[PDB]
Amino acid sequence: FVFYLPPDAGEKMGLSIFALLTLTVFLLLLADKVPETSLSVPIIIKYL
């Protein structure tokens, strides 16, 4: 929905990059749950 925001509102970065920040927070959330082996990649990490 950032592409539906007008350019004259001046809020495209403040939305999309903060979504990126929230995604980093969820990466921190999963940092202590997933296996640490390197034979394959978890599908949830692929999705993230």
Binding footprint of other proteins on the chain (CB under 8 A) = 27, 31, 34-45
8 or 32: CB nearest other proteins: 32
* Both tokens assigned to 31: 């940092």
- At closest approach, how far in Å is the CB of 30 from other proteins? 9
DSSP-assigned states of every residue in 3-45: GGS-GGG--HHHHHHHHHHHHHHHHHHHTTTS---SSS--HHH
10 or 35: CB nearest other proteins: 35
- At closest approach, how far in Å is the CB of 19 from other proteins? 20
